[PDB]
Symmetry: D2
């Protein structure tokens, strides 16, 4: 089965599984789980921050992050297509009583600071209270330019705004930068790390920031239902992935780039390729038919007028070649 629906579909490797079953656990609510502590300590150190916490999903990681930054009546500026506004059911507004202020991102995935400044509300009773700027890196595969990350950092400091980045695929960005995570994370107050995607764990995300911030995050994680007990078995997979699965993300990027070439040669309208993602403009007429066509040959895609293809450790170039041939035959 060839699955290009997302990098979320990754399955645990055997070495990862062996690490999961061998790890010492405890009750994380009591803070007694040594493996969860180790993962959190390692993630904080690796990113140059004071503290971190384990969460079941990236969705809760952002929900807890927004709650920890923004009070009732406060507002976060965010991308119209950003996950913690668009793809989390409006949790920040619905559950958190937080005003979302979405704006269109630039082509490079960046939220233009000139547009952000126009959205910063004056201290007047008619407006919500602008408190947070939320970024996404990578955003649909796109690696935000390093120069912007600095500019956004200084800007938020000058405007007394917090800066959070959704780093569900921040390690995809890191190897695209060719730098250390530390050199990127310095330009944010808090950020997330998804472990259950490209890094290939079955479950888990990380929220990392300063000590007092994370302390509040522990309260909100509890209320939202993320306070697990012996979650060290999951954290074990996270530790393994951070130490073994970061560098090999380059393979996913090369594969996606390779796949874009093959579909371009096959006559498909490849819109763009970024890291481990590639977007093909299939016909609205052809969308449903392509999905069914691929499904019949045991290839799984999310059928859509614009199809997103996502590479990961559970899809090789040999498998990509098979899909590309099916796509070619389809056209």
């Amino acid at each position: 089965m060839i699955d290009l629906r997302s990098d979320t579909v990754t399955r645990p490797s055997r070495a990862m599984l062996e690490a999961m079953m061998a790890a010492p656990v405890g009750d994380d609510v009591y803070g007694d789980d040594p493996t969860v502590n180790a993962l959190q300590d390692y993630a904080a150190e690796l990113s140059g921050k004071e503290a971190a916490i384990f969460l079941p999903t990236g969705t809760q990681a952002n929900l807890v992050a927004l709650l920890s930054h923004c009070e009732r009546g406060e507002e976060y500026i965010v991308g119209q297509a950003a996950h913690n506004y668009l793809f989390e059911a409006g949790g920040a507004a619905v559950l958190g009583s937080i005003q979302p202020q979405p704006i269109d991102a630039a082509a490079d995935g960046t939220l233009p600071l000139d547009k952000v400044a126009m959205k910063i509300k004056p201290d007047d009773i008619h407006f919500a209270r602008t408190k947070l700027l939320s970024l996404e890196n990578t955003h649909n595969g796109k690696v935000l330019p390093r120069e912007y990350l600095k500019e956004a950092w200084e800007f938020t400091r000058e405007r007394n705004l917090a800066l959070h980045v959704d780093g569900a695929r921040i390690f995809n960005a890191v190897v695209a930068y060719g730098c250390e995570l530390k050199e990127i994370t310095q330009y944010c107050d808090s950020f997330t790390i998804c472990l259950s995607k490209g890094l290939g764990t079955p479950v888990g995300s990380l929220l990392v920031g300063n000590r007092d911030y994370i302390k509040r995050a522990i309260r909100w994680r509890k209320m939202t239902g993320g306070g697990m007990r012996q979650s060290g078995i999951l954290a074990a997979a996270g530790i393994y992935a951070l130490k073994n699965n970061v560098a090999r993300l380059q393979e996913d990027h090369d594969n996606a780039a390779w796949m874009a070439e093959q579909l371009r040669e096959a006559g498909a309208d490849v819109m763009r390729q970024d890291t481990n993602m590639l977007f093909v403009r299939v016909g609205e007429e052809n969308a449903a038919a392509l999905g069914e066509y691929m499904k019949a040959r045991n290839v799984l895609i999310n059928a859509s007028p614009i199809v997103r293809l996502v590479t990961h450790l559970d899809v090789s170039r040999e498998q990509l070649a098979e899909v590309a041939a099916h796509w070619r035959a389809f056209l």
Copy 2:
């Protein structure tokens, strides 16, 4: 004192006051106040709708309106510069647990239906549940084209979305249309009426829609703190304004149009005028200075790089001419 800050600054006429003090009242919570009932019934009748309720402010009118349309987890599509998203402290999200979906309005004040359709969320657990489209008419004075109001009404029917319009200045649009309120209101499920602006009452707004909708709205008005007792004394001004102050809104429109002509001649950068509003592009350097200059001559404006001037029944053309002369002197 010349006040061009807003039409909210309007004060009660002698006749409006005499109507307030003569009006029969009761406890509105028990529904025993004959004057607000009369106002609500009259507003519903005038708009071809089933029911209406009196509210203390237009802000609550919209807050209650969004609460009544959208459940927890549901979403309303709205303008980035629209009032019930931008100028009400985000109440719908903060108090109502409603996801806001703002989009840029077109130059004519309309929310382009092609972008609205792109913002309608699929029935998937990742998205909020799109339920409502909210419009604003007038929007910063701008009168929405009638053809769009029909198109938007039809569009929402096709997508099974509700349609609410912020009609704080809907009567300004009505006389600009030259039609009846009903002929505009037919293109929405619910809409608001502000009474405390151009119509010139001290307090009050109306929310009007169908019977079941308004019944839910009564529950939300109670929770938000708008369930008043003898508000008939306030409603009386509303009845008077609906019957006496609608036609003369043309005066405010002509004044704004005249002032725009006058300010252009005085050397000011007049950007646009729509109904009873006028927008001048003043220097950021000159913004604060102009305000202070005008304040020292008993003229009140909201000092800003872009100044919004709003005409109303408490500012005459003679007064506009006086202000225009001060503006001319300021630019010399």
Copy 3:
């Protein structure tokens, strides 16, 4: 028409009306209404507090008050039968994201401090954050003992809790105390004043506390929809009532006490009488019939197995005597 449903049914006197129509107004949002300012300044001075604001209803006064005291996730301890928990549709929870912690009040209308202390949550992620103690005075007519008001004040200070009192009928308490409002309000951080009841205005309530507190209250009043424009016409009635209608509340108390005597003589089960309220235990069998019986003779009551009778400036003893005679005939 004789109306004993509530003191809310009071209608403006002519002198009050003449004051309403003569008062100077402005836009309160801009803070330009001199009459609203005068009322707020007078109420703050009279209560020994720094600031006050005008609101459309007592319900919003409490909703705004709870919002201004309690953040998202914080908790207020309150009576099970208290208005800002029971009779405001759960606004604090539904709109304000505030945990209510209701407890049974004592017979005297007091919330026992030993029970309050047991409800103060430890600083643990499993619990909401206890922040506020809310009192009600009067509570169903009952005047809370002065000694308790002090004890509750010291207790909340020692426990670092805020103390709010619903003073919708606090002036009924004041004349029952025979003291000044100032001597009662010293034992709270914030409190409310309803003007549209016994004081007899058509519309209005007041929220009064410290300067920073009220500043936050202005923001929440805006969001909740209480930011009126030329509300000076309503505030004018408030000023008149504070200066003319406080002392005469004694008449309402004497009338209610007199009425309790008459119904007791007529064979009705009068449960208790407090200030301008009295509660009669009519049959559940007789409840609907009594309501209809009184309605036919142009007497309005809230028909119920326990009927609450409320006196006010629009009901005299001559009218009370008529009702008592109807009640006597009914039995």
Copy 4:
């Protein structure tokens, strides 16, 4: 290390671990994980209900449950000491916009229906809208009498109220009843199952009810952050526990009962024992000292004036005897 803090501290057996690592997984968001589906289908089948969902915690299971039962402005009647009111940071009110109506439970852990009826709000705009009655079984170890569960189910039908039970320790009750889960679960619309306690899994709870209810619950689980991917590896432990660790809960009950007997003999004030829990009245002066005394001998308790001791598969009777000896020495 002797841990009597809670049954949450249970660790995976070798066989449970081997089941986890052998289990087929997929993306649960896409619904492609065969093991959680198997667990959910099995839990629904076992309880005579239509559907079930896997959740990371019991807290989210209840939060999602209340969200799915009660809309914004609606109310759930619940115990003052109940978990989904007291021990979940008030999530239902804070996140869910749900009015909580707590009442004191009776000594037997039941919410007396006469007080419940007194808390059911009339359909009036002054009140929240009573919609749900939430129970807890077991409640601090206490097994709710079967007759009450039937009475409460019937009562809620008559009042058109929903009935949810917090069944974090429902299987402890089941073996205490000596009946089948179905025979208990029939008296509710929805209920929860914690897997990470007495059943001994590292992570997981279940929410089970009817198809439409659970479908709504899936939306709320997503928003609250419980929509995991390959959680089948976690669900595998749940399947193992349901099939192997239910009957042996009797062991925990006998242990707690034995410990209560043993501690009474040692001179401790044993207040009560119910299923796998035991409550001792220690001095407030001795509370902190006892904890430190036990901690220094590798015995973990939650030091408190009233100490809750909880037995589980990771504490033997031999270990209980050791602790009882330390307690005896402490009191001498």
